[PDB]
């Protein structure tokens, strides 16, 4: 009773990788296939040891290990498109490790994942990480406000957005967090009602809002 | 809080007394 | 063979089965005639079946309409009961008509209820609508928010395009393979 | 006109329930006069009207504290609906 | 054969069977006489058939009209329950006149119901209409949107062309071949 | 095997078991006909099972709705009871419509009952809402708080975006393995 | 083996047992059919069990709700009784919706009852809330107090953030081991 | 029993391709035939292995690999008209790889699709992609607004449109996404309530001046 | 019966450490899994002596000992990412201990934990502990107010916050307290209404509150 037959009929959605500590790993790709494969090993129809790995829960585990032994590190993600050789997207302009310390980091990261043959640490530029987040946000015709600071940027989307705009913002944030992660650039969508719908106002240098024929409002800049 | 890019006065059914006071600074 | 729910209804048991089969456990639907249906599971997956009963709040309860609180067989009928048994029929007729579009699988429509406008001396307020939908995947679901909003705009007295909110999504991944019997 | 159609049904529902209690007590003992005398008849027609009047003022002496407060409440409610 | 629905009627069973046959599973209709119809699928097609029962919300509820909440055989007949019964038969008659055009398969019409517009001193508002339609394919469906707007315009008191909304669409692809028996 | 609860209900017994199996003690549900179910545990697990009965306050009470206090079966009903039954039917319908979004397992909606507006000459106040939700884990639930706020906003007369409070949270870790009998 | 209580309810008997097991004395529950239950302790543990009955005021009284003082069987209903039966149902729905948060074992909400404003000529006062909660240990219970206030703030008309008071605590140490029979 | 006999009677809507990793790929053409052919392999009346592919789902699959191994790449669409020799529409004026790097990209894309024989890489132009979107958006007489910026353009259509301009904008956008994809040019059909369909002027002292495109629109008293 | 088989089916969520004082420590990971293995040892289906350990309870157990035998010590957290060699994070800019005194501290902390081998003491910097808290508090766009004082800093997050700035701050404080400890830097998420709710006031060094159009009030300088 081998493990690849105890799963479903479709032998395409799972991938069984042999480990180094004498244990089999089943690599799902979402939470529905994760609970589908964890029900098999939990009800007990397999004699030896097996674990169910995932894209996210392995990315949040070597980030718990990383900020204890290697604090003050600047990195983005760990990419598992080929699970026998993951890619570690490190930053370039924010850390000054040498070629020997990058080999020590590439051996201590290999020792945490017994299914991986080697870890491919690649350094990446830091300007295109924010340029790809701004050029994709200008394309969807969304109002935003960039807040650059030291060691991360922040985009703030405000206003009374309608239903098309709050669906185009969510599909872009969800399609950007998959690639880069929320380590460097942070999005912040907050929506609020408009004060000036039926009101008359003056804009420019000296701006004010008329809340009544006899009422002035002077907003502070 | 008042999103318009340029400079100008927007009147939504004013009554020609509130309106000319906006021109009373220019 | 351990039972966990019995005395269920026909469309309730088809929901408890469709929830359990999504999480790799297999249930058995047994009739009892006048006593209703009953659902049994196997022995090694009884703890997970109890956990997914508690999590998803199963068995379901029947759906609530506003016209069930003001029944038509009553002897007296206030104008609030006639005005709410009439909003509660356009609220579930626009939902029936949203299901006949190209791509929609399910939909749900809510209307704002205004009752005391005609009683006292205030003018009536504007009407606010809201809708949900589930589209068949492979559709450009961002360009379909202006056709639901166009269809909903002039089915009432005077609404704006800022008072209609459509929140829609595509359906989940298809479940086609069998769960699989627990070998022991 | 919800308060108009509520005060009209409340007024007639309070007529049915205030005039039904001494009417049923006027005929429970009225039936316990006629059904009791099926043996040793001695029947006279004007006899049970005195006991029916005593049975009416007896239960009115019991419900006098309740008949007042069911009118005191509806009286305070029907003016508050009219003014405010 | 594992049963999944029973006690249906004639109009519900022909919709559940037509839905399942589009997705490569075959069903069997069984007349139980007085109790109603029934639908049975195969055992490999049972896990997939419960997923489309849950998805499409089958069996279908009966279509609701506004003249059911105010029946004609009641004691009281308020003016709100008379104009709500008149406007429901108008949108049931305009739909049957929309099905008699050249190339229309189905249609649905919605009239804007007015309730407190009569009893106050204020005059009633204008009338708003809305319509869906399903056309036969091969027709230039962009040009038949100006004939429904012309037929619906002067069938009422005073409507404008900006207050009528037509949302129409061609029909789906034809399903003509058999599903196929599950061999093993 | 000592008993600790008897005369229970089918819905209550599926929750006492789910609480006990989380804390590594095994229970047995026993049917008794029309006298309800009963739940028995082993001998060494008796000291811990009473402690989690006292802590989690088991058995559960039936969930209370505001429409239960004002039944529609009464002969004459106040406007204070008809408006309170209307807001309690809207409050259950928005809760049953929030469970049909993408990823919501359970939800609960509360609503302000402005019940003393028509009694005096003061105008009625604005309405407030507050919702809870339990999301399936694996989702970045910071951006899901604006879809529920946009859905609840223009589903009523006039709310603001700071009169709605949404407190939502991911689900707990799954319980899929059996507790295990103590050896003796 | 001397008995000390008899004729108890099931819910009272589980709390007398859960109190005696906390203080190292072993009790036995005897079912007597219609006549209820009975709690019997050993011989050397009698002078201590009778001390903890007097101290903890056991057996516990049934919990009182405000909706029991104004039953619906009354033919007439004052507005004070209707506003107290309405507030006594929001007071239980809010505490049943606080136990479904993340980490809450039990909760208890209190609303301020203002009764004379809806019938006198005086303006109504503000409304005040007060809640208690029992949390699972290991929780940041200072940061978990700012979302109970956010949840309770806009479930009513107009409260302030200083008119809500939350006093919450963590649960006690678990009692898992058996008490132990008195040897001599 | 072969795979092309276990499908329906009409043996012309599915095309069975032999793979290179000892598998068998069924090539449907839409989402209804994909579930029609997946139900066959799901119930399990076939002893070998078989997969069902598509044109959309096989185009979101090899773009996930591409924004991990070849980021900062400019491309449009992968066309599967002949499924044994796909065409990769690459952009010309936004990449800088030479002929030797394009053979490596054409080999690493060939290794991702085992049913294919050779992937053809054609460098399409970049100004005809926006010229074919503006001439087609001007032919239906729709009120549009072009927003040129670096690395993509954006056409916005606003206002209180009627039912003909909604059906025509939906009919053109879905016929343009099928050819070019939404990677370069994006459309922004949104319904507000103003009788001016997007544009806005301000009046002072000489006539009207055309304002810049902003977020706020003036509601229509009319 | 071995303890590794007396637990559940998943033989990875617990971990058995043979102690030095002839005992057997079970290392759980949270509070739900702590009571799962405490019910096993408390209902009596094991022969020898065993204990269940955690990370928060074991961090609070040997911090009582450092309030008696080493008072006025500056430290952050004890990390148990591998339970045989814990890492002790000591403050660098607030200690006055030599090489010998750090060795006798390691030898006195090793005897408290019989499952460990050698406690590794490393000196963490002090300005990075408040720099990671301020740079993390600025990314979530939260208003705050930093109060530096001797031996600790304090971040005050007050005002009338909405529902998204509560959820975006509860996920950062929980992710910072887990890795740095609540010994040095502390946050104060005090959600309250607007002080001086609807009252016009004249702030700054000679202040008054206008309780009414004809009523003044002179408290502390607003």
Furnish the topology, listing elements before pairings.
The structure is cut from a larger assembly and holds three copies of chain A, one copy of chain B (26 residues), four copies of chain C (184 residues) and one copy of chain D (84 residues).
Chain A: H1 3-6, E1 16-18, E2 24-27, H2 31-43, E3 50-53, H3 66-69, E4 75-79, E5 87-91, H4 99-108, E6 120-124, H5 128-134, E7 146-149, E8 152-157, H6 165-177, E9 185-189, E10 200-203, E11 208-212, E12 215-217
Parallel strand pairs in A: 2-3, 5-6, 8-9
Antiparallel strand pairs in A: 1-2, 4-5, 7-8, 10-11, 11-12
Chain C: E1 2-8, H1 10-20, E2 28-30, E3 37-41, H2 46-55, H3 79-90, H4 94-98, E4 104-111, E5 129-135, H5 145-153, E6 164-170
Parallel strand pairs in C: 5-6
Antiparallel strand pairs in C: 1-3, 2-3, 4-5
Chain D: H1 2-18, H2 21-34, H3 48-62, H4 64-83
User: What's the helix-strand series of chain D?
Assistant: HHHH
In the CATH scheme, what's the topology name of the largest domain in chain A? GMP Synthetase, Chain A, domain 3
Largest sheet of chain D: none
Oligomer: part of a larger assembly
Alpha-carbon Rg of chain D, integer: 19 Å
Number of strands of chain D: 0
Count, helices of chain A: 6
CATH class of the largest domain in chain A: Alpha Beta
End-to-end span of chain A in angstroms?
71 Å
Strand ordering within the main sheet of chain A? 1-2-3
Largest interface: C-F, 53 and 50 residues
Strand content of chain A: 15-25%
Number of strands of chain A: 12
| Number of domain modules of chain A | 3
The share of residues in helices of chain A is: 10-25%
Query: Helical residue percent of chain D?
Result: over 70%
Helix and strand element order of chain A: HEEHEHEEHEHEEHEEEE
| 3D shape of chain D | elongated
The assigned structural class of chain D equals mainly alpha
């Amino acid at each position: 009773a081998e493990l690849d037959s105890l799963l479903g009929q479709e032998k395409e959605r799972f991938q069984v990788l042999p480990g180094r500590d004498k244990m089999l790993y089943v690599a799902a790709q979402n939470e529905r296939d994760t609970l589908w494969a964890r029900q098999v090993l939990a009800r007990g129809d397999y004699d030896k040891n097996a674990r169910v790995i995932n894209e996210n829960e392995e990315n949040k585990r070597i980030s718990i290990w990383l900020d204890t032994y290697y604090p003050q590190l600047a990195y983005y993600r760990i990419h598992f498109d080929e699970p026998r050789k993951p890619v570690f997207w490190l930053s370039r302009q924010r850390n000054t490790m040498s070629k020997k310390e990058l080999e020590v980091l590439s051996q201590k990261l290999r020792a945490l994942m017994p299914y991986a043959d080697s870890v491919n640490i690649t350094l990446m530029d830091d300007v295109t990480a924010a340029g790809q987040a701004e050029a994709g946000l200008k394309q969807q015709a969304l109002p935003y406000s960039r807040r650059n600071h030291k060691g991360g940027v922040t985009f703030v989307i405000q206003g009374a957005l309608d239903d098309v705009e709050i669906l185009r913002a969510r599909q872009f944030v969800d399609s950007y967090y998959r690639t880069w992660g929320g380590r460097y650039v942070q999005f912040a969508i907050e929506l609020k009602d408009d004060w000036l719908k039926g009101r008359s106002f003056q804009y420019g240098a000296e701006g004010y809002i008329k809340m009544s024929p006899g009422h002035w409002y002077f907003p502070s800049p | 809080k008042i999103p318009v890019t340029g400079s100008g006065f927007v009147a939504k059914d004013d009554s020609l007394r509130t309106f000319f006071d906006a021109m009373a600074l220019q | 063979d351990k039972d966990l729910l019995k005395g269920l209804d026909q469309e309730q048991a088809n929901e408890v089965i469709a929830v359990l089969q999504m999480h790799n456990i297999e249930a058995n639907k047994i009739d009892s005639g006048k006593l209703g249906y009953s659902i049994t599971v196997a022995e090694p997956d009884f703890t997970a079946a109890v956990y997914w009963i508690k999590t998803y709040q199963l068995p379901p309860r029947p759906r609530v309409e506003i016209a069930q609180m003001f029944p038509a067989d009553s002897l007296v009928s206030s104008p609030r009961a006639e005005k709410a048994r009439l909003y509660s029929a356009i609220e579930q007729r626009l939902e029936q008509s949203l299901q006949t579009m190209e791509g929609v699988l399910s939909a749900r429509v809510h209307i704002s209820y205004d009752i005391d406008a005609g009683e006292n001396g205030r003018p009536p307020k504007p009407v606010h609508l809201s809708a949900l939908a589930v589209y068949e995947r492979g559709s450009p679901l961002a360009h379909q928010i202006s056709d639901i909003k166009r269809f909903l705009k002039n089915s009432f007295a005077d609404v704006d395009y800022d008072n209609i909110s459509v929140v829609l999504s595509e359906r989940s991944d298809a479940q086609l393979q069998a769960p699989g019997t627990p070998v022991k | 006109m919800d308060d108009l159609v509520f005060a009209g049904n409340k007024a007639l529902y309070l007529v049915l329930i205030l005039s039904g209690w001494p009417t049923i007590v006027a005929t429970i003992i009225g039936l316990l006069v006629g059904l009791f005398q099926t043996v040793t008849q001695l029947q006279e027609q004007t006899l049970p009207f005195g006991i029916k009047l005593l049975g009416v003022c007896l239960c009115l002496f019991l419900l006098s504290g309740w008949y007042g407060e069911v009118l005191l409440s509806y009286g305070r409610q029907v003016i508050f609906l009219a003014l405010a």
